[PDB]
Amino acid sequence: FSNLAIYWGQGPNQLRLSHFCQETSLDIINIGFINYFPDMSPGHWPGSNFGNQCDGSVYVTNDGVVTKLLSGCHQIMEDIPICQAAGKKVLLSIGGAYPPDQSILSEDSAVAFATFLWGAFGPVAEGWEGPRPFGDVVVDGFDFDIEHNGGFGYATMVNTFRQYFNQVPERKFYLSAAPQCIIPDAQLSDAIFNAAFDFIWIQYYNTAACSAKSFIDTSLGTFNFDAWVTVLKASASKDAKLYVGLPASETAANQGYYLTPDEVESLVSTYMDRYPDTFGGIMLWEATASENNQIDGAPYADHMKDILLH
Ligand SMILES: CC(=O)Nc1nnc(S(N)(=O)=O)s1
């Protein structure tokens, strides 16, 4: 079967992560966001935000400098294991919408960024004397939701993560990317060409030229999933599965990009049929919008899984 991914962490008044860990239909949950990068953040540690989650406390560096990395995410720490017990993959997402001034400035800081995240969030290692924001929890991988400021250093980060993954062959870890629909994508086409992602979720909303809506109304633009299949072929991500990223309600993205379940089926059955090896499934922005959009007594994400399984 194909997979259903969804982001969580940035939903206004979102329910805690375990609620979605309890939702059968979800296969992958991207937790957003590591939103502050080491080159420009306080203390030069990565920083995090998970909306209404965590108690507000932050770590400080060895020299007393206040960071933006949250240290009291009790609920998330408790909930991730529930997701993984139910068979789900939990990916920690890097970037997100806010703030808009974060980037990577050198290959060195790229390596060091991924090293830091691997130590903080990957396997517990005796040689690590740094922060463990989710304690003994080990995430299943990293998602690159780079929304601003170009594509420097993300390839190096992915390559560094892979190297670290390969030193733990008894466990599988995953790398993913969320480019927008226009090729080249200013943030992620470089990483996609130069480094290997397992999953790539194209955000099929907010860009008129190629949106999922233009599949339904072809006067709007041209849905370009075919082009994304072609562009993988020269890339180091040539074996990536491609997912159709969609808004989970009317108000989750810009006006006019939401599709009804029936509209999604028409798109998905066409493309699932056309690319049975490359089509990975659906990505949803995002969990709260899905949960609040109840259709026939079930949230949007459940109807998305129906379409993928039917
Ligand atoms: C993966 C993903 O979609 N990330 C997003 N970040 N901001 C979005 S928004 N508010 O412009 O619709 S979507």
Author numbering: 28 to 337
Excerpt from the paper describing this PDB structure:
A. fumigatus chitinase A1 (AfChiA1) also belongs to the class of plant-type chitinases family, and has been cloned and characterised recently. Because of the inherent rigidity of chitin, fungi need to partially hydrolyse the chitin layer for cell division and morphogenesis, which is carried out by family 18 chitinases. Whereas the ‘bacterial-type’ enzymes are invariably secreted and mostly possess exochitinase activity, the ‘plant-type’ chitinases are frequently cell wall associated and possess endochitinase activity.
AfChiA1 crystals, reported previously, were soaked with acetazolamide, diffraction data were collected to 2.0 Å resolution, and the structure of the AfChiA1–acetazolamide complex was solved by molecular replacement and refined to an Rfree of 0.249 with good stereochemistry. Electron density for the ligand acetazolamide can be seen in both molecules in the asymmetric unit, but it is less clear in chain A, where the active site is partially occluded by a symmetry-related protein molecule. Thus the further discussion of the structure will focus on chain B only, which is less impacted and has a more accessible active site. The overall binding mode of the ligand to AfChiA1 is essentially identical to that observed for ScCTS1. The thiadiazole ring stacks with the conserved Trp312, while its ring nitrogens accept hydrogen bonds from the backbone amides of Ala124 and Tyr125, in the latter case indirectly via an active site-bound water molecule. The acetamido group enters, and essentially fills, the small AfChiA1 active site pocket formed by Tyr238, Gln230, Met310, Ala205, Tyr34 and Asp172. It is oriented by two hydrogen bonds, one from its amide to the side chain of Asp172 and one from the Tyr232 side chain hydroxyl to its carbonyl oxygen. The sulfonamide group on the other hand forms few direct interactions with the protein: it accepts a poor hydrogen bond from the Trp312 side chain and otherwise points away from the protein and into the bulk solvent. Kinetin failed to show any discernable effect against AfChiA1 even at concentrations in excess of 1 mM; acetazolamide on the other hand inhibited AfChiA1 with an IC50 of 164 μM, which is an order of magnitude less potent than previously demonstrated against ScCTS1 but not dissimilar to the level of inhibition observed for allosamidin.
